[PDB]
Amino acid sequence: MNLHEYQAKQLFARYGLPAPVGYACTTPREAEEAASKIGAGPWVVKCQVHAGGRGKAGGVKVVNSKEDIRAFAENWLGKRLVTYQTDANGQPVNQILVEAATDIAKELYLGAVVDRSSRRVVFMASTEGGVEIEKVAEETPHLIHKVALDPLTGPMPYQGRELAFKLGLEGKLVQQFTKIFMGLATIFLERDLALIEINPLVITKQGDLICLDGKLGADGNALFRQPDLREMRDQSQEDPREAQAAQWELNYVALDGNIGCMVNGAGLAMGTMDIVKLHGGEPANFLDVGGGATKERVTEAFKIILSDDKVKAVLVNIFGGIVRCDLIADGIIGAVAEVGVNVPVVVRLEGNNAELGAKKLADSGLNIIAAKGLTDAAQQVVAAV
Amino acid sequence: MNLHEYQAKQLFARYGLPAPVGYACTTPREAEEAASKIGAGPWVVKCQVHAGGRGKAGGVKVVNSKEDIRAFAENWLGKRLVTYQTDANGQPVNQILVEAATDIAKELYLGAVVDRSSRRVVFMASTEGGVEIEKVAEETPHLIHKVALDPLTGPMPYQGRELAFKLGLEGKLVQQFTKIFMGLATIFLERDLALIEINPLVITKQGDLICLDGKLGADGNALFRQPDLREMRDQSQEDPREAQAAQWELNYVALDGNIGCMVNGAGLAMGTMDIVKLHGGEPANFLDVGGGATKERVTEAFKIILSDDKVKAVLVNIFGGIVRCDLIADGIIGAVAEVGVNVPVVVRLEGNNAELGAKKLADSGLNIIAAKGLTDAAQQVVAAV
Amino acid sequence: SILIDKNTKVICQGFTGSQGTFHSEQAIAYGTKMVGGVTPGKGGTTHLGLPVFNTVREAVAATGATASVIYVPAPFCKDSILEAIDAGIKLIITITEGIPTLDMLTVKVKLDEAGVRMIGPNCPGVITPGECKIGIQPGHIHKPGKVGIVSRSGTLTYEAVKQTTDYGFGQSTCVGIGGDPIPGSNFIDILEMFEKDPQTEAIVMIGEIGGSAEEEAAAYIKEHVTKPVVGYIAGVTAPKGKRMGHAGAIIAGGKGTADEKFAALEAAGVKTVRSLADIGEALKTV
Amino acid sequence: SILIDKNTKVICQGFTGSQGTFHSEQAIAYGTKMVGGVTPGKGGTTHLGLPVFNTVREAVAATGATASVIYVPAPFCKDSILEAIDAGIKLIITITEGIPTLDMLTVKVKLDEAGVRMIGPNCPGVITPGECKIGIQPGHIHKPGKVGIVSRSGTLTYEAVKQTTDYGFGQSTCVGIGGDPIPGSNFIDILEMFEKDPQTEAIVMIGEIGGSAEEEAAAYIKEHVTKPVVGYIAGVTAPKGKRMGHAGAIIAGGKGTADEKFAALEAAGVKTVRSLADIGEALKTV
Numbered sequence A, B: 001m002n003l004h005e006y007q008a009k010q011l012f013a014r015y016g017l018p019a020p021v022g023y024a025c026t027t028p029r030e031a032e033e034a035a036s037k038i039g040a041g042p043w044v045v046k047c048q049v050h051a052g053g054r055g056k057a058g059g060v061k062v063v064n065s066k067e068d069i070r071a072f073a074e075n076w077l078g079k080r081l082v083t084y085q086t087d088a089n090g091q092p093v094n095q096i097l098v099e100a101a102t103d104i105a106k107e108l109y110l111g112a113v114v115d116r117s118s119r120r121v122v123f124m125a126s127t128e129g130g131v132e133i134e135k136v137a138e139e140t141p142h143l144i145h146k147v148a149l150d151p152l153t154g155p156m157p158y159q160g161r162e163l164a165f166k167l168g169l170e171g172k173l174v175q176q177f178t179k180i181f182m183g184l185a186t187i188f189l190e191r192d193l194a195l196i197e198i199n200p201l202v203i204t205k206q207g208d209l210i211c212l213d214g215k216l217g218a219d220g221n222a223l224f225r226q227p228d229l230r231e232m233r234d235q236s237q238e239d240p241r242e243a244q245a246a247q248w249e250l251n252y253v254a255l256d257g258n259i260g261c262m263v264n265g266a267g268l269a270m271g272t273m274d275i276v277k278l279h280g281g282e283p284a285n286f287l288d289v290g291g292g293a294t295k296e297r298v299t300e301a302f303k304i305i306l307s308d309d310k311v312k313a314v315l316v317n318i319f320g321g322i323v324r325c326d327l328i329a330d331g332i333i334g335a336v337a338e339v340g341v342n343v344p345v346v347v348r349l350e351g352n353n354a355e356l357g358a359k360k361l362a363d364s365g366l367n368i369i370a371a372k373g374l375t376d377a378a379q380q381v382v383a384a385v
Numbered sequence C, D: 001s002i003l004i005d006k007n008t009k010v011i012c013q014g015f016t017g018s019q020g021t022f023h024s025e026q027a028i029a030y031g032t033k034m035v036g037g038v039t040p041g042k043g044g045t046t047h048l049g050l051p052v053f054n055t056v057r058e059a060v061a062a063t064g065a066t067a068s069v070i071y072v073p074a075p076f077c078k079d080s081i082l083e084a085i086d087a088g089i090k091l092i093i094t095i096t097e098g099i100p101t102l103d104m105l106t107v108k109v110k111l112d113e114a115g116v117r118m119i120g121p122n123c124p125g126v127i128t129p130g131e132c133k134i135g136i137q138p139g140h141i142h143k144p145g146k147v148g149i150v151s152r153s154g155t156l157t158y159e160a161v162k163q164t165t166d167y168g169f170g171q172s173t174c175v176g177i178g179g180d181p182i183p184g185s186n187f188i189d190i191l192e193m194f195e196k197d198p199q200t201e202a203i204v205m206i207g208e209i210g211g212s213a214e215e216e217a218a219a220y221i222k223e224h225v226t227k228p229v230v231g232y233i234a235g236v237t238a239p240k241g242k243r244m245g246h247a248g249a250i251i252a253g254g255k256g257t258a259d260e261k262f263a264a265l266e267a268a269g270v271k272t273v274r275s276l277a278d279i280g281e282a283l284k285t286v
Ligand SMILES: CC(C)(COP(=O)(O)OP(=O)(O)OC[C@H]1O[C@@H](n2cnc3c(N)ncnc32)[C@H](O)[C@@H]1OP(=O)(O)O)[C@@H](O)C(=O)NCCC(=O)NCCS
Pocket: C013, C014, C015, C016, C017, C018, C019, C020, C038, C039, C040, C070, C071, C072, C073, C074, C076, C079, C080, C095, C096, C097, C098, C122, C123, C124, C125, C136, C154, C155
């Protein structure tokens, strides 16, 4: 899960890492009172959404008076900000960050991720700050230095000086960078994060390092042991259907398509949408039935999928499970009548009572088509639509 | 360095491990006021010295009234307690520990040390509590189970349950023992200890685990990074000459002998006392000159050695160094006159200007004998004495 | 066949739990040589006829098992993997989904240093059709035969199992490597086994978005694999940036897409199939 | 000769410090091939004529050194050992005394996994009389020759060096393994080298109280060492329970006494000498 900027900053503070003085605000009254708690301006006001590309979208400005603070806060609180990394709807801005403006001499890039290829946490540094690191890799991949935490020893200072030097830093800044490398590596490990991106990490006109932006990603699987982090999640930043799906043990991700897929297995669900794409269809979502296809679970799944209104037909595709192919066909037949699906449903069952189940479906009289195999099932919906 | 019991107990508390409620006291007034802060008696009063075998020496009693508290405190505060592990003088008791008496069902043994042979921290458990674990090893070595912390992973609960089971514990006590294994392993690592001995770790008549005694040893070399522990040292428990020696970069340990040895090198100092023993002498001390044999350093060394009054002759033996064999002979000749040594000194110099130096010594007129080799040097002092 | 066989004696860590009980009853049915199991606290009892021990070492000294299947919830997984390794088990098969990636990071390093093999976590397990089933797969679809399958997904494996059975090929050993980001065994550790397996005539390799192991394998195949490999990759329609059900299924950094992987498999001279429905077909052709 | 020779190119970590400067001037005098050194912050300068770098990797890419001698104070030792290993040095010689035992515990595990060799810590270092000196020993006592010495103490080594020179034998390579509780190399790693060294005709093995390595070696000698070994152990008069100057010199648990060790050396068929003065003599006899 993702953290807000202001939330990363506050963690950085708990570990003693530099960030600008700033306040997170929820009403314009708080936003303009922050001005004088911070100091003389000017000030930076920033929309707090989980997405990147806020600067470009208008969600980050430097301003000179309390009046302009109140005005930004009034113009954004409650609106949705759409950035090149958010969808068509953007994300709700329910919070503005007001911080002291910074005297930027130079901008560096400091980041860490878990490298699957090496099976290590890897910190990467570079002199090209203020730029998508993706661009820098393909473009000037030599302008990026890396180190890799050793699991037996934990982060060590030679790794931090090593990188300080590679960036051409010298003096007190080498040690300063070093302390910052030590603190982030420790936060990473101690809080089970999956990602850190400080872009830019800035050398100030006064010669100090300061993390100017902060972008954390925690690992969902460890929340069971990160209570505080558990509490920091902002649901409002997520498609509510995804969280709704997870309550009933499903795995939804929505898309732009007329065809719904309900499958049991993330690998199978992806294979299925690809098979539908491949035969001219356009899948509207990924749905992976987590718990056994019970009636009640099967029903929810219908609601979620059909919450999108571009949906034109539903392909259900179930190979196996702890529920007999005939029992599911009942649940389906049931869901359709009770949830009121008004779209054709093509259904591929495969396992125990498959054949028996496909007959209940056919006899049902509802607009449920039993496919004779997967390739058939694909062709029919694509056709249905 | 060693910790007092009451000091181990207080650490145990900081980490959430069970110990009896108790107060450390310095005046009998505090010792008898503890009675009612603890509860109804009876109570255990214990002399706080670094040494073992206090129980046997009279330094641990269970008592029934405040009056007996005051009486023990009056009988011991300021006295030296001599235990089978202390010397002829014992150690000063400047502190009494008064704790609630405990309802002992069973006594176990829980300990950890750094195993040189395996190069691992090793926890050992056993059912024979209340007994020198040394006796138990040679005697019923099978009654001792061990585990070894893995450096890559840190202590893990399967190691703690593993041992709980081996001890025949079952139920809530397995988990209780487990938590205690997890906490001690963490204290061990986090505070750079060298030794832990909980003997006995007691199962109470009420079914809980409680560390009844506690005996910690920290590693001297890490004090640079254990400030709190640095502060807990009780110098009064040590031969003051040892600490005095260390200030001037020497390594003294005193003994029962008439012959003094001043050597440069711990290996050489030991080889030298053995060579003197071997030719009928009785070495009175180990002294290892740490800094170069300067005049001022050489002098101190004389004071320390000759602080003991059974000393009959001094064998100085120096092979090498950053000080020219002739310069030392000066320092020696100097020390002798200024420190006023009234014992013959046999001196083996070996290195640069050795021959030159042995001549200054001889010509000096003082009672300083230059040996012609080590075996000679040994024979002469042994003879001198 | 690789990894397991009619002779592998297996213990279950999590034996008395729901999934542990359920799926152990099925292995037992299958003829799998379950020799017993572990649940701390319940030692001294007997479950599904097999003895239940207090610690994996106790179980191993009692039974001689060399493999273990783990059905212990995420929070205690790493401790149960580490225990197993410390007790002298050489093959671990972990079904448990939800293990924190960093727990996996360290366990993997220990696995390798100690030379113990783990299949998983988050995986359907392992079957040598005919002799051994450890896992959750439905055994009635399999048939002793000559294709070997390695997949990064469970049910997706069942599609291929069912084609190679219908086309009459059957399977030497089906292996699910799990869907997490850092599994205890990758494609390469497994391709190397199949290549050396005489019962293995062709290899089906099923992968999906995220990571770069398929690519890493594309390049090991080219240099060290002489049997024919048919490869399918699920993900082509996946959004960039979202976790697609499996924890390791995510295109991170505009990298690791379905198409890159197909494209790297082709070069290695792999028979990529763009419809999962044609795995049967393509192998017929090989 | 073992470990180092007229060809070993060496860098110094702690180069600009007091001991680093001092003892580097002497190696240089000796003919040791010091190619440069490391002090973070001082890179780009030159000290004793040699270039000074900012990180061990910088130094290694510049100079091709494969050995490093470390004169960095205890508090930062572990970080400097780990850096060296990570930069591709294969031989580390650490003089530094006062390293916390637990720091040594972990560094040793890493040393072994990475196959890098460390002599020390808390040791006089290493000399191949004639070609290479890295350490603090006074080189004028040595003489190229046929005895190899391993010791757990520095000055004690000088007694034997000086006998084997006087009796005309001289030395192949003198090795000080250090006096701490967990050194990076024990007797066994070193006896195995001498045994395989043609220039080595007999071996002098000097130890002292504490630990059990001498014993461990007594038993490896018996089985795998064919040259003659004369052994001396300092400690016989040591009190039980006190640290005798060296941090690993302490009879812990009434175990590891001088007499046990002599006694275990004898059995292995070692020529124990009970007076350090007779090492020359005994070898004459061998
Ligand atoms: C692992 C998993 C199956 C456990 O679920 P469960 O069996 O429903 O859980 P239970 O609580 O019922 O059983 C777990 C057992 O572990 C036991 N246990 C806990 N820690 C253990 C340890 N270290 N050693 C041994 N057993 C342990 C528990 O005590 C329990 O048994 P008990 O009830 O007799 O006490 C579940 O976490 C899971 O991962 N589900 C997803 C599986 C999946 O999708 N796999 C991917 C395949 S494609």
